[PDB]
A paper describes a structure:
Propionyl-CoA carboxylase (PCC) and 3-methylcrotonyl-CoA carboxylase (MCC) are biotin-dependent carboxylases (BDCs) that catalyze the metabolism of odd-chain fatty acids, cholesterol, and specific amino acids. In contrast, PCC and MCC have their BC, CT, and BCCP domains divided into two chains: the α subunits contain the BC and BCCP domains, with an intermediate BC-CT interaction (BT) domain between them, while the β subunits solely consist of the CT domain. In humans, PCC and MCC catalyze the carboxylation of propionyl-CoA and 3-methylcrotonyl-CoA (MC-CoA), respectively. Both holoenzymes are dodecamers consisting of six α subunits and six β subunits.
The cryo-EM structures of the PCC and MCC holoenzymes alone, referred to as PCC-apo and MCC-apo, were determined at resolutions of 3.02 Å and 2.29 Å, respectively ([Fig figs2], [Fig figs3], A to D and [Fig figs4], A to D, [Table tbls1] and [Table tbls2]). The cryo-EM density of the BC domains in one layer of three MCCα subunits in the MCC-apo structure is missing. The acyl-CoA binding pocket, also formed by the CT-N and CT-C subdomains from two β subunits, switches from an open conformation in the MCC-apo structure to a closed conformation in the MCC-ACO structure ([Fig fig4], C to E), with the major conformational change occurring at two helices (residues 474 to 517) in the CT-C subdomain and one helix (residues 243 to 252) in the CT-N subdomain ([Fig fig4]).
Residue numbers in the entry:
A (entry chain I): 499 to 640, 648 to 715
B (entry chain J), C (entry chain D), D (entry chain H): 23 to 563
The structure:
Amino acid sequence: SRKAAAKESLCQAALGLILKEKAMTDTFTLQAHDQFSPFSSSSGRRLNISYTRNMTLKDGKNNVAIAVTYNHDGSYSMQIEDKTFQVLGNLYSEGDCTYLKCSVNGVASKAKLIILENTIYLFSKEGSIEIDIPVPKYLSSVGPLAPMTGTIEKVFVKAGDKVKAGDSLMVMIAMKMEHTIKSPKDGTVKKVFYREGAQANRHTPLVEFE
Amino acid sequence: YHGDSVASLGTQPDLGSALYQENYKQMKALVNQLHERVEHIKLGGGEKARALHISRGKLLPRERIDNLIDPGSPFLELSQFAGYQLYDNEEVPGGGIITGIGRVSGVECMIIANDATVKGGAYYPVTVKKQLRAQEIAMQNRLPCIYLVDSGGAYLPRQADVFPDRDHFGRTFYNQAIMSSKNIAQIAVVMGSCTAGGAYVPAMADENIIVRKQGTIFLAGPPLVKAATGEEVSAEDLGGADLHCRKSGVSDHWALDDHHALHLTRKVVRNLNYQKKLDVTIEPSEEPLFPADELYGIVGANLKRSFDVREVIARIVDGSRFTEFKAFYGDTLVTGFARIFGYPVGIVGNNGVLFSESAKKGTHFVQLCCQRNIPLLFLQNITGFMVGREYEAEGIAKDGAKMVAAVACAQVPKITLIIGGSYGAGNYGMCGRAYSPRFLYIWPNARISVMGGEQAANVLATITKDQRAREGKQFSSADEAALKEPIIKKFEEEGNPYYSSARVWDDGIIDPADTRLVLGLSFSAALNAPIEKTDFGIFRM
Amino acid sequence: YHGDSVASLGTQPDLGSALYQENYKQMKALVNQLHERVEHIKLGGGEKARALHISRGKLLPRERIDNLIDPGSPFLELSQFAGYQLYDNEEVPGGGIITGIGRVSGVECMIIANDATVKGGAYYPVTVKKQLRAQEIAMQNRLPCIYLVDSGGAYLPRQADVFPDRDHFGRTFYNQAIMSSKNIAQIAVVMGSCTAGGAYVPAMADENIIVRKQGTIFLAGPPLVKAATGEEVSAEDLGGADLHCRKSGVSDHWALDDHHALHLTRKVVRNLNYQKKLDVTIEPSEEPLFPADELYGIVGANLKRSFDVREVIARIVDGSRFTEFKAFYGDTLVTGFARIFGYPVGIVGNNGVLFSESAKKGTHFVQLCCQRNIPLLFLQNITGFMVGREYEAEGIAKDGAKMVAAVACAQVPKITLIIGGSYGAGNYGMCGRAYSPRFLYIWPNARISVMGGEQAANVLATITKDQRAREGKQFSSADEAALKEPIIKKFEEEGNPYYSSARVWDDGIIDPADTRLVLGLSFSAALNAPIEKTDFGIFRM
Amino acid sequence: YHGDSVASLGTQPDLGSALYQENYKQMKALVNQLHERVEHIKLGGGEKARALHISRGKLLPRERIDNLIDPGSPFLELSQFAGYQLYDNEEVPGGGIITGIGRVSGVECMIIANDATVKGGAYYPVTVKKQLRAQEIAMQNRLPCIYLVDSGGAYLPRQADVFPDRDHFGRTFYNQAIMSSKNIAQIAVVMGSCTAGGAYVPAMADENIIVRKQGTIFLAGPPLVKAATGEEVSAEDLGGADLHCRKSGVSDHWALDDHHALHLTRKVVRNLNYQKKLDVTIEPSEEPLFPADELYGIVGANLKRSFDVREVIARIVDGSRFTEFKAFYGDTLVTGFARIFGYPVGIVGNNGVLFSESAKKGTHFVQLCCQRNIPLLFLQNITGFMVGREYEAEGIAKDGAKMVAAVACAQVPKITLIIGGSYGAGNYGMCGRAYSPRFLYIWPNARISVMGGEQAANVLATITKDQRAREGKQFSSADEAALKEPIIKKFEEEGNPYYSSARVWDDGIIDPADTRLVLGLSFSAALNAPIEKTDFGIFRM
Ligand SMILES: *C(=O)CCCC[C@@H]1SC[C@@H]2NC(=O)N[C@@H]21
Ligand SMILES: *C(=O)CCCC[C@@H]1SC[C@@H]2NC(=O)N[C@@H]21
Ligand SMILES: *C(=O)CCCC[C@@H]1SC[C@@H]2NC(=O)N[C@@H]21
């Protein structure tokens, strides 16, 4: 079965993600007119205070919160649950592969860093660990109303039915223009409010989900 | 060509000298005090209001700015010390508001975030002062402005100091109306509840964002409706996000929660069609050859002893290189050419009292910097302006007036940094606050008053001795000490960096070492605007 | 052609009605009180300091302005009521300074005269506020500026409130440096003794004048020389007129006495090569058909009763003619076209709360006035902004925001006059102080606050009744009266014309009748500048 | 930064649904019909005239444009369907002329080639219409213009419709005279025989090319010389290439044959000193995530059923990404921000009748696109403008007028594409032909009329029923059918894409799939000109 990641392995995943974001920043700068300028160094240098980034990584089924403090010398202090790790490292290339060079609490290591859509792959000489980046709700979300004031030609569904998203619920004609309603939502219909041949108005609810 | 070698500034200081140890210890004490004070100001309104802020699903405002800017980007906060002991029993951290410059989607944006944990996000007069300062920073530098609206009404018993004047609260909407006519994009993100005057801040935006079940806009609150009409209405039924996105049309984007609103903000900024163009010339950057804990040791805390300002310019420029202009004529002013982070800088600094030769050298250097379109960095360490009968006979007044005219007419991005004292009309000549620099930071040892405490105490002692000798009474040593303690005490208290930065007289007490990085950040924002041609007035010859 | 006949405004009021008698009596009482207060402010620092001012051969400052301007010319004083009960035991008449607009050698000049009879001519913070207001009036309107320098040092225990900020004392020299780069001529007449910060006011002038045995300029006084050096020197030996005209070269003309200095000032102004050019169109002037003691009877003192604003526009325009624009749609705002003294004016006035139809009508009218380059006169009589659930559902916020954007982006010479109440954000929509009008006068019945006293008292009464009914304690009538007396008292005291005009929030309480003449004078100065093309921002549709 | 992930549009349609099969089959039938019609138009004047064109050593005109442009370059032909059944028995393929945009020596040039195989290359009135359209496309977009002159005289019995008016034939020379004053280079290549009015087309060129024994220029032909004088002269002896290159001086380069003339044309274009500068910002290009045979299935042929316009915007933009502006307020108009081929586009599309909220959203979006200098792509699928008594009471007229004013004042490169119906005054609001877009293409299912056929038939049926019921006669079903068949028939015939594109009301019926590529090509030519600042008129609030 799959085994849980060690806290040091989560530090490596967090560091690889941070350095990948830096890489994107660096390749943006290479195309900029304003070259050599500050803001291009992903140092997290706040004025008079420190910056702590709170990120969450998903280890299998469970979420782990990692608080990453940006240190003045380029190191990171990553606190995972309670334990603080001193995390340093960088990226280097050998041919067409990218490697992540780490030092965590004085322990040096090297692993291949591949980030594909959401999953962070770390390939080392002791195994292979897959850490997932959680996807926020507003990127994964993708009842209905009447478009105008018209008469309904054909109903489709009743209570007790089930439709899946992108389904015909109703067709209504409003000043000679056939409008087929569809479902952005999902589930099971609890009530259909307008039977076929009745007059529905503008922004009037047609069906309902309980 | 750009290849030949050039001598550099800098002297390795005597690290074993007891003057170095005492100066280093006292400046380190000042910087540690600064550190612990800003770590107390960072928490905001305290743990009770932070619990009631996170219990409604709201991100805390520093977390909002952390999730808004590019990942790993440095944030330049402005005026972190506003409202510090400015009101009697009212502790207002940060003024109630968090303003700074950050990097959003590759664009340097100016961010204005209402901290709602401090007295409901209500507007104090210093909050309005800090906000209008941020908005003219955005207008001078052409920075797109982002507001994170979470208000709680203007404060009532201070209402005079907030409402009617020219630079009171309504000026804010003036600043959004003018900046929209100039293509400086204004985004408002309604994360809270702006009410009845603050509802113009989302309504005057070029592109707006609102949050469901959390963000309310109305010109009249439910107390005002219940008093004037008698109709009970809630907040979300009156001015909620569904009502404004769907029926009224005030909001332009709709957001599920706070993270969605900041994501949508980054989208709106990415589709602004803005491309940064530098008109100055850039060289590949370098580093100073001397560290800045040496600036702790060099500069120190006592203002009686002088130092060399060149040992500051060795510590903050690229390569420690410095082309000194007119180096022997009037060496109480040090003017030269350097580079910070690639940008060409004309550096003007002090070394003593200002003779007329120093003012002539300063006027010549400011004219060179405006003819070649080079920015100017002024470093203030002023005692005064060289008293004497002979010097007033020479016309020392018209030479200081020439420096003031050339400094005030200059169109290049000027940045002032007060590394020591800043007293009197020399403060006007070296581009103080009233002469519109881009940014004005100070060090934690600075003093700024109309004169020094000893000058005021001693001229008042001599004048009162002169009038009593015309009178005849005995003016003893104890009468002189009772005359000299409250003048010194008042000019010491009200000349502090914390007294000056509790208002928005300066853009923030900065660490000496961080000085280098901070100047680079400042200059980067100031190069977001094209440089206009300078035309001076009449030089009083 | 311009010959055909046109109907006119105006209704003869019921002069026998007891409402007219009571309104007339109460407004006459207000105007008589204004008269006696300004006759006390006119004397200045009192007879002792006036005797010691005339014992040195010095003209008194009002006599200086009387001998400076053209013979018989009207003088428009600005902010006569500054410093009125603004400091605790310190009575500062006129702020210490006399600023106004006059006609010198045929040119409208802006005159700034240091009254030396009031605390030695020392600069109070309100003196700096009044002076910087005068200087931006001169810069907006392109008026040549004349200073009559008689100073006594900046005030010491208020030094913070005078020295460091952006709009503190040093801004003055910024304003003379920028205005000299724009060909706006600056004349300083040293009639007194400017000292050590004020000596930049003569030194930064394009052409200077000094008086023998009476006028001293130095950057350092004889106390400072006697303290720093130990050399006893007088005032005239150190910085006298002979030393400055002959050796140092600070002064450009030399004057025997005060009359010679004012004569030389008129010569310097005559040789400025300035020729006034109007870009607006002028018609031959006329008179109102109704007198303005009728404005005493119409308007009165109570703000509860409304009146018609058209009966004001019949009393102040030429011929009582008024082309009313969009007269039925949203008649809580009255917008039309008239002429004062030949000048074309677009008049915007109030008649009640501001519905959304009123804001749309206002935005349309301001766009017409900026497309045709017509000046704008705003008349403020505001209660509020029409509370209700339906009106917030309609988007009443975005309509007020459209009026604020069009008012703030407008480049025509705008003049505000507050003929009644001016409360809240409607004050921002009708071009209040923060939206940069040219001049802003008020009537002696006006009130200006963030809300009315009754609104604040009643919404606080209803909110505290809400929270106690959630609590459970008894909130009686006596608790409500003890809740309602200090709110009403504070909003009545701090909403006064004398409280608002003790600061420089407004350019002066004017008589109602004199209103007509005053507006003409104001508009004449505002036409000394060419009119720029207006470009608006984004209209939130 | 530009690195974070963003959601995208697009829904995979139900490919098994019988609606999809029927819509796909009917749109495929329309596109195949388009294909075979343009393959018949491509041959030109037929094989007899093509044999007599190649027997004189002349390249055919499509071979001329194939050898003129860069190798492998896409050619964008404009108005391939002009003259389609426009004259009674006269079949005029392509109008007689071949106009398009191509890439010559790295420069986007506009090419105008006289097809001499179709009625001797004579000018029909539609030929003049097509040519003047091409020339204003070259002037709007600053494209250098190349003419391949092979004329046969203006047509005589249509001479009125060709000669005198403003936009008749002589306007051509006006267009070459104005464009030469603006540095838009005009090259004429005389490959044929321009005669007596067309001889100004080579003579007004900035640099000219002629072909020996093949190219003749004269202001008077040998019939006119033989009639007026009686001197027999040939064509080559009168106005040949040797006479014009050697004695008269009309031609500037001399060419052996057709290939030499096209080679010399490419030389002349290479030495124009033109360097393209983009002022917009570019991102690295991408692809749509959904193919466009899905646009066949989605859109279909029937105009009764609606579709989602967002499923079109998923199919034509880069990455299928689309930042939707004001997504809930008035969702009968879809406005958002996207990118095509790197270029930033502001996309405005329809989804139904236009309420007042839709017009307000449209006015706001066009103001955003002109403030940020972003191009605009309008997609027209209009039924009408929402009839009703309440909506006329709301002022639906002034909101449509605001959208028309902001669309007409806009200076950004606008491109219209009519993906469905386009009826009535909504056609004016969504930037139809009379509002000067850069290019206006249509799809083969579009309809364009002053109203729909059913609207005209039904309002005429109800009006005639209303007047007969005032009269008294019987208006039966058969009288109604005889009333409704010719109105429907006429509005169906004259609303076609082939009826609209037989004139130059649109720049060409394009395939749906090719739509994506075509828009990119169009936008590339439209970015050859710098973008001017937009200033709007008066917004009727
Ligand atoms: C001693 O108590 C201080 C006396 C005056 C201060 C000195 S004198 C020279 C410097 N210039 C100036 O105006 N003040 C400084
Ligand atoms: C009574 O004490 C006053 C209640 C509120 C004041 C009224 S309600 C309508 C006007 N608009 C506004 O905002 N305030 C005024
Ligand atoms: C039926 O034959 C059509 C009647 C009118 C056409 C409809 S009504 C609403 C749409 N708007 C418009 O002006 N015409 C369309």
